[model samples]
Target: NVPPKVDSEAEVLDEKVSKQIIKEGHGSKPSKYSTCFLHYRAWTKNSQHKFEDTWHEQQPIELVLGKEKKELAGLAIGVASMKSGERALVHVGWELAYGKEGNFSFPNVPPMADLLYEVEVIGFDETKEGKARSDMTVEERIGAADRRKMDGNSLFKEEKLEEAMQQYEMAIAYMGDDFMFQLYGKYQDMALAVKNPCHLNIAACLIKLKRYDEAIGHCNIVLTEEEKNPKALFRRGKAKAELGQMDSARDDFRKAQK
Candidate 1:
């Protein structure tokens, strides 16, 4: 059975996170855009049994604040309130935790059940792109963007559009304008190579999402740099057709075919 104990000093934060600090940390607390490293375990409040544990795997997990979707909202909220080296027992309400559907495997959780997470914050990186990016030099950012793009490609092949879109966006963030400007010649060209592909990939996802105007905008960015880009021309043509601009679409399609 799971431990049915929550200390009397438990602090309730806004947004359904209730926590009792087991070990106090010394430094600054994590905030938006921070990348937190943690060892965590989860249990259902009603079942009195644990469902998941990162400690058992002998490796901690990483969670990027503000980037994860609804499934991890409670965990992110709880960790955001913690400082480095802190350990806390956090209780999450059903709505913010797993919602009505609950989890179905690895220790099945019943629908509408609340969850308890035992979390230990190893550390965090506070930069906008994250600690990982801060540690990487300009040349390294190209490699980083490439890795994220590969991840996005795999997700796209699996038909996970929303998740894929985020990865492509993250890839672009690594090779952003500010960072790219710091490099020149070959370095800048390498970064642009990654960024342009990311734009095209994001446009593809946008087209699938039915955000035709946004898709057209992304394709336009690519076309501005490489006028003869076949993929960009074809995608922009598709977006135009969806928006009922048949004449413009035909023009784009003709150019793409050339």
Candidate 2:
């Protein structure tokens, strides 16, 4: 697909991302952690062939800045400078667009290629989790936490352990130990349902990452809440064994077995 040429010249931002405003939008700009709904089409510099285009999908993609990969870093950086309803032609420098390795996926992006993007920022939500937590009800917090936990689960399956750990941590923050005291029976149970699993899963991730001490700490949290948790006991045993605590490791494994 061909992108029509615009009259305005591109203006560079912080010497990283450059843009030419197609239509000026009002309202607040997207912050570092804001979630945005937007459409975009991308082309390699001086190439008519489009490597990426969200328009053909018929649905605007959701982007969370500071949490995405380097592939979408240009979009995240460019969109951060834009307000809702703004349309711009963004030109990302080679380094920021895709570095030496580049991407070998569907579009087959070569290394050191600068990129051109037609970006439209439809809207955004300022949900940095901290502020959003205050705005949410207890039930909302539980739901949000569980959702992030599921995302962690999927990420874990993909072997993205570090990102998965962060997701689980984010999940815990929403329905953490603080909520356990404030909430009654059912709500407390709901909070634990998400929190314990997240801790256990994060421990699993940490163990795989070779952060044995941190893994043991997470396992301890789950064990404190649920003494009979087989997974936590097993993980803690593994972490202990890694740290050369054979006797304690054997004790945890034996306890887990029963």
Candidate 3:
């Protein structure tokens, strides 16, 4: 971490992966049910800017780890051995990143790339959903969302609007409250990254249902975090137009164009 190098002399965490402690933290190791607070900066292995910096974004992430929960392995594995207030530079292989499929959630992230994350343990939840998602990890939550989106996509292709809407709702449920209030409530990037599409999908379904009000609500959530989200703006425009708010709708369309 010193000198800001991606790879450096460090402690081995896994095969072909390691970490260099940047700052030491004092506290007992967290329990599976413990809660955590953090600050992070992420980049590709080559030190390419990932456009994800919790520190700069002013969005510190929070987590509740427990028995049987959805967890993102790259992050979880990197974090498992950490203590409160510890800061480390985690170097992960492509397998620990978005993997073979790569990630299109944000711009310019190439496929099958390795990743680097500077994680700081700001604090843990001493700590909600069907089947108690408190037991799930970040990866699991994203997986659940993806599965639901897939189901919705299938139904959408079949022209089943209501069914697709139901699936989208299920996907959103998996995302839960993945945001922390800070600097406009900037979200935990990965979870919100997964969630926005679900909102957009449901907004599409709502438009189909002629429930423009509800469609607008869904789009609002997406725009709250991603003001420039093209699909959200487009969908909101349609909803506004349907409600006879032509001026507002036109504004949304103009933003979309920009």
Most accurate candidate by TM-score: 2
* Model 2, C-alpha of 123: deviation from truth (Å): 25
Query: Each model's C-alpha lDDT?
Result: 0.79, 0.78, 0.69
**RMSD (Cα, Å) of candidate 2?**
14.5
The residue-by-residue lDDT of candidate 3 on 1-258, one tens digit each, is 222654446888778467887778897555333457788777787756664777777889875543322213566666755888998888777776666776676535667777778889988654222342667655555555656776686788535478888988887776666422221212255446557887888887887787999999989988987697887888899989889999899999789877
lDDT by residue (1-258, candidate 1, tens digit) is 354465648887756888888889988775445678899888887776787888897899888765655666788878977899998888888788777787787657778788889889999875433454567766456666766776787789636487888999988887776787687865666667678888889997888887999999999888987898998899999999999999899999889987
Clashes of 1: 1
TM-score (all chains, Cα) for each model = 0.48, 0.49, 0.47
**Model 3 misplacement above 4 A:** 1-134, 158-160, 178-187
The segments of candidate 1 whose C-alpha lies over 4 angstroms from its true place after superposition are 1-133, 158-160
Worst 10 residues of 3 by lDDT: 178-187
Name the regions of candidate 2 deviating beyond 4 angstroms.
Answer: 1-130, 158-160
How far residue 24's Cα lies from its native spot in candidate 1, in Å, is 50
